Amino acid sequence: SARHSRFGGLLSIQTPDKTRLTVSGSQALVDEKIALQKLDDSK
């Protein structure tokens, strides 16, 4: 992320069914593969 760690951008990804998951990170704000990678890694 270009900005600092505490910038604080929050995400809401929509699953094929109508449920929303939350991800943090500008890269997630831009991309979806990064979002899924973070979802897997945060487990």
Binding site: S12, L29, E32
Partner: protein
């Protein structure tokens, strides 16, 4: 689909909107917005602004 938390505005629409704004925009729009259209010239105002700003930055 990517949506900002707590809102109903898509990120993809935002990205495409700002990309369209940057690739195509002229100072004449700003001049007319501020009610200064009569000061519009024919060379600087009619040339792309932020494209020039990106080229000079590069």
């Amino acid at each position: 689909l990517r949506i900002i938390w707590g809102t109903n505005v898509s990120i993809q629409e935002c990205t495409t909107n700002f990309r369209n704004f940057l690739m195509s925009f002229k100072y004449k729009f700003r001049k007319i917005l501020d009610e200064r259209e009569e000061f519009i010239n024919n060379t600087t105002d009619e040339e792309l602004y932020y494209i020039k700003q990106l080229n000079e930055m590069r």
